[PDB]
Structure formats: structure tokens, C-alpha cells
């Protein structure tokens, strides 16, 4: 659904997800 840098405030986690 979105493939992107899924930064959160203390872990950013950049992958792909559906």
C-alpha cells in the first residue's frame, strides 16, 4: 500500500509495505 521511509518520532523504518 505505501513504500516509503515510515519514520516515527524515536524509529524510522524505511520499507515496503502493501
Known sequence: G???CLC???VCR???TR
Open 2 to 4: 505505501f513504500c516509503r
Open 8 to 10: 516515527r518520532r524515536g
Open 14 to 16: 524505511c520499507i515496503c
